Amino acid sequence: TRFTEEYQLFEELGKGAFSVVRRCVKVLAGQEYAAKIINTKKLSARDHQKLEREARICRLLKHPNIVRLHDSISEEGHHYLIFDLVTGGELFEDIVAREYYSEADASHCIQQILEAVLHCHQMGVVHRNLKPENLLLASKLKGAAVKLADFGLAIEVEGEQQAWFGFAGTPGYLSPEVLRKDPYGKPVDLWACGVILYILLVGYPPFWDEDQHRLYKQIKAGAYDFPSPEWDTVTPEAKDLINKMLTINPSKRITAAEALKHPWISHR
Protein backbone atom coordinates (compact mmCIF):
# COMPACT_ATOMS: atom_id res chain seq x y z
CA THR A 1 0.00 0.00 0.00
CA ARG A 2 0.71 3.74 -0.26
CA PHE A 3 2.64 4.54 3.02
CA THR A 4 5.56 2.07 2.72
CA GLU A 5 5.82 3.38 -0.95
CA GLU A 6 6.02 7.14 -0.09
CA TYR A 7 7.43 7.63 3.50
CA GLN A 8 10.43 6.04 5.35
CA LEU A 9 10.57 5.57 9.23
CA PHE A 10 13.38 6.62 11.71
CA GLU A 11 13.58 7.04 15.57
CA GLU A 12 10.69 6.34 18.06
CA LEU A 13 9.49 9.68 19.53
CA GLY A 14 6.62 8.35 21.77
CA LYS A 15 4.69 5.31 23.09
CA GLY A 16 1.16 5.45 24.64
CA ALA A 17 -2.18 3.71 23.87
CA PHE A 18 -1.45 1.05 21.12
CA SER A 19 0.09 4.14 19.36
CA VAL A 20 3.87 4.36 18.60
CA VAL A 21 4.97 7.82 17.20
CA ARG A 22 8.16 7.90 15.05
CA ARG A 23 9.92 10.54 12.88
CA CYS A 24 9.47 9.85 9.12
CA VAL A 25 10.20 11.45 5.69
CA LYS A 26 8.34 11.55 2.33
CA VAL A 27 11.12 10.15 0.01
CA LEU A 28 9.95 12.30 -3.00
CA ALA A 29 9.71 15.64 -1.12
CA GLY A 30 12.55 15.10 1.47
CA GLN A 31 10.11 16.64 4.03
CA GLU A 32 10.14 15.31 7.67
CA TYR A 33 6.81 14.48 9.47
CA ALA A 34 5.61 12.83 12.71
CA ALA A 35 3.91 9.42 12.02
CA LYS A 36 1.47 7.96 14.62
CA ILE A 37 1.72 4.15 13.93
CA ILE A 38 -1.27 2.21 15.42
CA ASN A 39 -1.24 -1.61 15.78
CA THR A 40 -4.56 -2.64 14.16
CA LYS A 41 -4.54 -6.50 14.61
CA LYS A 42 -4.74 -5.38 18.30
CA LEU A 43 -7.90 -3.23 17.52
CA SER A 44 -11.67 -4.03 17.19
CA ALA A 45 -14.19 -2.83 14.52
CA ARG A 46 -15.56 0.32 16.28
CA ASP A 47 -11.96 1.29 17.37
CA HIS A 48 -10.95 1.33 13.67
CA GLN A 49 -13.96 3.71 13.44
CA LYS A 50 -13.06 5.82 16.63
CA LEU A 51 -9.60 6.38 14.97
CA GLU A 52 -11.21 7.44 11.60
CA ARG A 53 -13.37 9.97 13.64
CA GLU A 54 -9.96 11.30 14.80
CA ALA A 55 -8.50 11.68 11.27
CA ARG A 56 -11.75 13.30 9.93
CA ILE A 57 -11.41 16.02 12.67
CA CYS A 58 -7.63 16.69 12.35
CA ARG A 59 -8.46 17.28 8.59
CA LEU A 60 -11.08 20.00 9.42
CA LEU A 61 -8.35 21.99 11.27
CA LYS A 62 -5.80 24.12 9.44
CA HIS A 63 -4.17 26.41 12.12
CA PRO A 64 -0.68 27.67 13.12
CA ASN A 65 -1.52 26.54 16.75
CA ILE A 66 -3.03 23.10 15.79
CA VAL A 67 -0.84 20.07 14.88
CA ARG A 68 -1.80 19.67 11.19
CA LEU A 69 -2.68 16.12 9.98
CA HIS A 70 -1.13 15.76 6.47
CA ASP A 71 -2.55 12.35 5.34
CA SER A 72 -4.18 9.18 7.03
CA ILE A 73 -3.41 5.67 5.57
CA SER A 74 -5.01 2.20 6.32
CA GLU A 75 -2.45 -0.47 5.34
CA GLU A 76 -3.30 -4.09 6.39
CA GLY A 77 -1.85 -4.39 9.95
CA HIS A 78 -1.20 -0.70 10.83
CA HIS A 79 -2.68 2.86 10.44
CA TYR A 80 -0.45 5.96 9.91
CA LEU A 81 -1.62 9.47 10.79
CA ILE A 82 1.06 11.86 9.45
CA PHE A 83 1.46 15.04 11.55
CA ASP A 84 3.64 18.18 11.55
CA LEU A 85 6.97 17.19 13.24
CA VAL A 86 7.17 19.20 16.58
CA THR A 87 10.38 18.65 18.64
CA GLY A 88 9.85 21.03 21.63
CA GLY A 89 8.37 18.25 23.87
CA GLU A 90 5.19 18.73 26.00
CA LEU A 91 4.38 22.13 27.63
CA PHE A 92 3.95 19.95 30.75
CA GLU A 93 7.71 19.13 30.89
CA ASP A 94 8.68 22.76 30.01
CA ILE A 95 6.59 24.02 33.03
CA VAL A 96 8.23 21.39 35.33
CA ALA A 97 11.71 22.31 33.90
CA ARG A 98 11.13 26.08 34.46
CA GLU A 99 8.92 25.61 37.61
CA TYR A 100 6.58 28.43 36.33
CA TYR A 101 6.29 31.01 33.48
CA SER A 102 6.52 34.80 33.63
CA GLU A 103 3.18 36.57 33.01
CA ALA A 104 4.80 37.77 29.70
CA ASP A 105 5.37 34.08 28.70
CA ALA A 106 2.11 32.59 30.11
CA SER A 107 0.25 35.43 28.26
CA HIS A 108 2.08 34.56 24.93
CA CYS A 109 1.42 30.76 25.43
CA ILE A 110 -2.29 30.86 26.49
CA GLN A 111 -2.85 33.44 23.58
CA GLN A 112 -1.78 30.77 21.04
CA ILE A 113 -3.77 28.09 22.99
CA LEU A 114 -6.99 30.28 23.01
CA GLU A 115 -6.58 31.13 19.23
CA ALA A 116 -6.43 27.36 18.49
CA VAL A 117 -9.47 26.71 20.79
CA LEU A 118 -11.36 29.58 19.01
CA HIS A 119 -10.64 27.89 15.63
CA CYS A 120 -11.55 24.39 16.98
CA HIS A 121 -14.95 25.84 18.14
CA GLN A 122 -15.84 27.76 14.92
CA MET A 123 -15.24 24.40 13.10
CA GLY A 124 -17.71 22.86 15.57
CA VAL A 125 -14.96 20.80 17.33
CA VAL A 126 -14.72 20.64 21.20
CA HIS A 127 -11.35 19.15 22.39
CA ARG A 128 -12.62 17.99 25.85
CA ASN A 129 -9.08 16.76 26.90
CA LEU A 130 -6.97 19.97 27.05
CA LYS A 131 -3.90 19.76 29.43
CA PRO A 132 -0.18 20.69 29.13
CA GLU A 133 0.56 17.04 27.98
CA ASN A 134 -1.71 17.57 24.89
CA LEU A 135 0.18 20.81 24.10
CA LEU A 136 3.43 20.45 22.02
CA LEU A 137 6.09 23.25 21.89
CA ALA A 138 7.75 24.11 18.52
CA SER A 139 11.25 24.38 20.06
CA LYS A 140 12.37 24.77 23.75
CA LEU A 141 13.26 28.51 23.17
CA LYS A 142 11.71 30.79 25.92
CA GLY A 143 8.73 31.89 23.69
CA ALA A 144 8.32 29.53 20.65
CA ALA A 145 4.98 28.35 19.12
CA VAL A 146 2.43 25.99 20.83
CA LYS A 147 0.13 23.54 18.97
CA LEU A 148 -2.87 21.34 20.09
CA ALA A 149 -2.81 17.53 19.75
CA ASP A 150 -4.86 14.35 20.74
CA PHE A 151 -8.31 15.08 19.20
CA GLY A 152 -8.72 11.34 20.15
CA LEU A 153 -11.42 12.64 22.60
CA ALA A 154 -12.74 15.45 20.30
CA ILE A 155 -16.54 15.80 19.62
CA GLU A 156 -18.54 17.59 16.82
CA VAL A 157 -21.20 20.10 18.11
CA GLU A 158 -24.02 21.57 15.93
CA GLY A 159 -24.10 25.38 16.73
CA GLU A 160 -24.13 26.50 20.45
CA GLN A 161 -26.32 23.35 21.03
CA GLN A 162 -25.32 21.67 24.40
CA ALA A 163 -25.86 17.88 25.05
CA TRP A 164 -24.58 14.92 27.09
CA PHE A 165 -21.62 13.74 24.91
CA GLY A 166 -20.76 11.47 27.86
CA PHE A 167 -18.10 11.66 30.65
CA ALA A 168 -14.48 11.69 29.34
CA GLY A 169 -11.18 13.64 29.59
CA THR A 170 -8.57 14.10 32.37
CA PRO A 171 -9.78 14.42 36.02
CA GLY A 172 -7.90 17.71 36.96
CA TYR A 173 -9.15 19.46 33.79
CA LEU A 174 -12.85 18.28 33.90
CA SER A 175 -15.58 21.01 33.95
CA PRO A 176 -18.24 21.18 36.69
CA GLU A 177 -20.98 20.50 34.07
CA VAL A 178 -19.19 17.23 32.95
CA LEU A 179 -18.83 15.94 36.58
CA ARG A 180 -22.56 16.69 37.32
CA LYS A 181 -23.52 14.69 34.10
CA ASP A 182 -25.39 17.87 32.98
CA PRO A 183 -25.47 18.67 29.22
CA TYR A 184 -22.37 20.64 27.96
CA GLY A 185 -20.73 22.26 24.88
CA LYS A 186 -17.83 24.53 23.86
CA PRO A 187 -17.23 26.10 27.33
CA VAL A 188 -15.84 22.86 28.83
CA ASP A 189 -12.51 23.71 27.07
CA LEU A 190 -12.35 27.31 28.55
CA TRP A 191 -12.54 25.63 32.03
CA ALA A 192 -9.43 23.61 30.93
CA CYS A 193 -7.78 26.88 29.77
CA GLY A 194 -8.45 28.12 33.35
CA VAL A 195 -6.62 25.13 34.96
CA ILE A 196 -3.82 25.35 32.34
CA LEU A 197 -3.30 29.18 32.68
CA TYR A 198 -3.16 28.77 36.54
CA ILE A 199 -0.56 25.95 36.13
CA LEU A 200 1.31 28.07 33.53
CA LEU A 201 1.72 30.83 36.23
CA VAL A 202 2.58 29.05 39.58
CA GLY A 203 3.68 25.45 38.74
CA TYR A 204 0.68 23.48 40.18
CA PRO A 205 -3.07 23.19 39.45
CA PRO A 206 -5.95 25.11 41.14
CA PHE A 207 -7.58 21.73 42.10
CA TRP A 208 -5.88 18.50 43.31
CA ASP A 209 -6.38 15.60 45.77
CA GLU A 210 -4.81 12.08 45.73
CA ASP A 211 -8.38 10.80 46.51
CA GLN A 212 -10.24 11.29 43.18
CA HIS A 213 -13.63 11.83 44.91
CA ARG A 214 -12.27 14.85 46.87
CA LEU A 215 -10.81 16.22 43.58
CA TYR A 216 -14.24 16.05 41.76
CA LYS A 217 -15.79 17.75 44.87
CA GLN A 218 -13.19 20.65 44.65
CA ILE A 219 -13.97 21.15 40.88
CA LYS A 220 -17.85 21.10 41.32
CA ALA A 221 -17.57 23.69 44.19
CA GLY A 222 -14.99 25.70 42.17
CA ALA A 223 -12.76 25.63 45.30
CA TYR A 224 -9.45 27.21 44.04
CA ASP A 225 -7.63 30.33 45.34
CA PHE A 226 -4.37 32.39 45.07
CA PRO A 227 -1.98 31.16 47.86
CA SER A 228 0.89 33.43 49.23
CA PRO A 229 3.67 34.23 48.67
CA GLU A 230 3.58 33.21 44.93
CA TRP A 231 0.20 34.80 43.88
CA ASP A 232 1.06 37.88 46.09
CA THR A 233 3.10 39.34 43.17
CA VAL A 234 0.89 38.19 40.18
CA THR A 235 -1.18 40.94 38.36
CA PRO A 236 -4.85 41.40 39.42
CA GLU A 237 -5.61 41.13 35.63
CA ALA A 238 -4.16 37.57 35.36
CA LYS A 239 -6.20 36.43 38.42
CA ASP A 240 -9.27 38.13 36.77
CA LEU A 241 -8.91 36.11 33.52
CA ILE A 242 -8.50 32.83 35.52
CA ASN A 243 -11.62 33.84 37.60
CA LYS A 244 -13.71 34.31 34.36
CA MET A 245 -12.30 31.03 32.94
CA LEU A 246 -12.98 29.11 36.25
CA THR A 247 -16.62 30.38 36.49
CA ILE A 248 -18.76 27.39 37.67
CA ASN A 249 -21.81 28.33 35.51
CA PRO A 250 -20.96 27.50 31.82
CA SER A 251 -23.31 30.21 30.35
CA LYS A 252 -21.76 32.98 32.59
CA ARG A 253 -18.19 31.69 31.62
CA ILE A 254 -15.79 33.62 29.31
CA THR A 255 -15.65 32.40 25.62
CA ALA A 256 -12.41 31.89 23.62
CA ALA A 257 -13.16 35.06 21.55
CA GLU A 258 -13.89 37.06 24.77
CA ALA A 259 -10.63 35.73 26.40
CA LEU A 260 -8.57 37.02 23.39
CA LYS A 261 -9.87 40.66 23.93
CA HIS A 262 -9.21 40.52 27.75
CA PRO A 263 -6.57 43.13 28.83
CA TRP A 264 -3.95 40.53 30.02
CA ILE A 265 -3.84 39.27 26.31
CA SER A 266 -4.03 42.63 24.35
CA HIS A 267 -2.20 45.53 26.22
CA ARG A 268 -0.97 49.02 25.02
Binding site: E99, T170, Y173, G203, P229
Partner: peptide, 19 residues
Protein backbone atom coordinates in the same frame (compact mmCIF):
# COMPACT_ATOMS: atom_id res chain seq x y z
CA UNK B 1 0.55 15.68 51.55
CA UNK B 2 1.55 19.31 50.67
CA UNK B 3 3.04 22.01 53.00
CA UNK B 4 2.00 25.74 52.89
CA UNK B 5 5.00 26.60 50.59
CA UNK B 6 5.13 27.31 46.80
CA UNK B 7 7.71 24.50 46.31
CA UNK B 8 5.57 21.90 48.22
CA UNK B 9 2.46 22.87 46.18
CA UNK B 10 4.53 22.46 42.94
CA UNK B 11 4.65 18.63 43.59
CA UNK B 12 0.85 18.44 43.04
CA UNK B 13 1.80 18.94 39.30
CA UNK B 14 1.56 15.30 38.03
CA UNK B 15 0.73 13.86 34.56
CA UNK B 16 -2.81 12.31 34.46
CA UNK B 17 -4.37 9.71 32.05
CA UNK B 18 -7.82 10.13 30.38
CA UNK B 19 -11.28 8.77 31.54
Amino acid sequence: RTLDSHASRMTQLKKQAAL
